[PDB]
């Protein structure tokens, strides 16, 4: 099936690999070389996971967990049931995410639009590879990565953070959380603005960008503008993930002590380190 205005866009071209070989759709889905690659990587990984489910002894979604090689294995390979499948599944996951991005690039080329979406998606992928690849490799072992399990990965988040006390004190974690909070704030506002204009009070006429600018100008003394808010949401989101990746890439590597104590560089500053009074004096 097609959307009423879709056919004029389903033309040949845009593919990065294989010419018109895989240039076709399956229902609403565009295929392409990378659509096939993705399916491959995804099918395998799902299968390899169902297999790990058998070796673990469970078919329950809440229980199936796939752990990386124990620390003792370092960055080498480990037996399938002992961290191998994880290692293989991670390969598939990466292969499927990167393939999904590339498929996107092709969709962009066929549609004549910018590459912003896959570019954005790339940040998520990079966050993922920071947790399962870059940080582990920098730390010396795959055991530092998180396990693939609905609840078991939350365990890893908790233990990993408490390994440094209150993870709240990680300075980069603070910035990251800001962007996430600000992004959610911005999204709530952006959606409410456009909607409050497209859907005015009963019987009235749709408002306009002028009204939108007017509303925020009246409310807080500033309007970023329709091109601006979209530039902002993107910026906030990506910045949020960039700092997430950064807050962890530095943890267990350049800083491995209690994050709270990191803040001592500031308090110990010569010109006030020894002054009495206050909390730290």
């Amino acid at each position: 099936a097609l959307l009423s205005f879709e056919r004029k866009y389903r033309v040949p071209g845009g593919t990065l690999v294989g010419g018109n070989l895989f240039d076709f759709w399956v229902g609403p889905f565009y295929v392409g070389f990378f659509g096939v690659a993705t399916f491959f990587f995804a099918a395998l990984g799902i299968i390899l996971i169902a297999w790990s489910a058998v070796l673990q002894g469970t078919w329950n979604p809440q229980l199936i967990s796939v752990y990386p090689p124990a620390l003792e294995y370092g960055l080498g390979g480990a037996p399938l049931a002992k961290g191998g499948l994880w290692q293989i599944i991670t390969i598939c996951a990466t292969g499927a995410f990167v393939s999904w991005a590339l498929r996107e690039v092709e969709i962009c080329r066929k549609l004549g639009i910018g590459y912003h979406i896959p570019f954005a998606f790339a940040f998520a992928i990079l966050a993922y590879l920071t947790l399962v690849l870059f940080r582990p490799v920098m730390m010396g072992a795959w055991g530092y990565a998180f396990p693939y399990g609905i609840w078991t990965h939350l365990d890893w988040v908790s233990n990993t953070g408490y390994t440094y006390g209150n993870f709240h004190y990680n300075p980069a974690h603070m910035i990251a959380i800001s962007f996430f909070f600000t992004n959610a704030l911005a999204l709530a506002l952006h959606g409410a603005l456009v909607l409050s204009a497209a859907n005015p009070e009963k019987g009235k006429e749709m408002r306009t960008p002028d009204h939108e600018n007017t509303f925020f100008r009246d409310l807080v003394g500033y309007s970023i503008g329709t091109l601006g808010i979209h530039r902002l949401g993107l910026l906030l989101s990506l910045s949020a993930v960039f700092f997430s990746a950064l807050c962890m890439i530095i943890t267990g590597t350049i800083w491995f002590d209690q994050w709270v104590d990191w803040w001592q560089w500031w308090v110990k500053l010569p010109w006030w380190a020894n002054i009495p009074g206050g909390i730290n004096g």
Binding site: A184, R217, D218
Partner: protein, 301 residues
């Protein structure tokens, strides 16, 4: 090579836009503020004008009163020593009344009284500002979406410092006013309730937080991707679908099998964001009042 539209290549300026009048009392509208060429590379360069009726003045006054109530106490903690003020800036904290005082106001000023005062100013500041988001919308004839979404944020806030402390029977439950302490209160709250990761509402709240970042990244990027077809003019694309809106929808249909409309995407947007603090507020409200330990609660339900 190709331009991305992240920063403007060239800025243009014209007369200060004074905005739509509609049913707004221009007497309360201030004058235009300066123009920021800095802001201009990213978004609109014009600052102001801002509206400030009575409610506005009220809110700004309470707001500052709140902040100053906390700040004076911060100075007092530094012994009025500028050097100590700056170095221990994140360590100062204005704590609530000890449990002993329940929900009374007996507590001494240096022991919860100031907290209650500051909290009072903030209560007025926030609620008055909320009424402000509603009225500014009404004066322009617009929907009340903003005021409704803002209510969801107000909900978490209200629950954290007023509704929960009350049901709990004491102001000691409330959040202290401090950078680091408010973080400590947060960690402690989780430890004390069996770890919020076990709280189904904390988990949903997280899905929406991550969801808001995923969706805004998607949306923002999409609009920028079709800004070459004027996609950023969302209201008119809603009223007369253009090739921008169609390519936007088709990028996602082809990618994930389904898509949005130029108006609908904003409904997805407003809810994704709004549900962060909605589920969150419930999650916290139930903590200590109905569930003491989420791990435990989880074992049974």
């Amino acid at each position: 090579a190709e331009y991305q539209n992240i920063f403007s290549q060239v800025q243009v300026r014209g007369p200060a836009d004074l905005g739509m009048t509609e049913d707004v009392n221009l007497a309360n509208r201030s004058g235009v503020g300066p123009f920021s060429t800095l802001l201009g590379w990213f978004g609109n360069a014009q600052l102001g004008p801002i509206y400030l009726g009575s409610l506005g003045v009220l809110s700004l006054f309470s707001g500052l009163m709140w902040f100053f109530t906390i700040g004076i106490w911060f100075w007092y903690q530094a012994g009025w020593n500028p050097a100590v003020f700056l170095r221990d800036l994140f360590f100062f904290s204005l704590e609530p009344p000890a449990p002993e005082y329940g929900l009374s106001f007996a507590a001494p000023l240096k022991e919860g009284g100031l907290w209650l005062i500051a909290s009072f100013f903030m209560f007025v500041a926030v609620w008055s500002w909320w009424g402000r988001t509603y009225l500014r919308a009404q004066a322009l004839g617009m929907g009340k979406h903003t005021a409704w979404a803002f209510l969801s944020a107000i909900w978490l806030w209200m629950v954290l410092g007023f509704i929960r402390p009350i049901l709990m029977g004491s102001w000691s439950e409330a959040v202290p006013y401090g950078i680091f302490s408010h973080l400590d209160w947060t960690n402690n709250f989780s430890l004390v309730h069996g770890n919020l990761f076990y709280n189904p509402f904390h988990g949903l709240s997280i899905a929406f937080l991550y969801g808001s970042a995923l969706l805004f990244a998607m949306h923002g990027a999409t609009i920028l991707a079709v800004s070459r077809f004027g996609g950023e003019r969302e209201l008119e694309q809603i009223a007369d679908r253009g090739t921008a809106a169609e390519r936007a929808a088709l990028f996602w249909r082809w990618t994930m099998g389904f898509n949005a409309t130029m108006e609908g995407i904003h409904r997805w947007a407003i809810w994704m964001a709004v549900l962060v603090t909605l589920t969150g507020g419930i999650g916290i409200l139930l903590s200590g009042t109905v569930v003491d330990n989420w791990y435990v609660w989880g074992q049974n339900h």
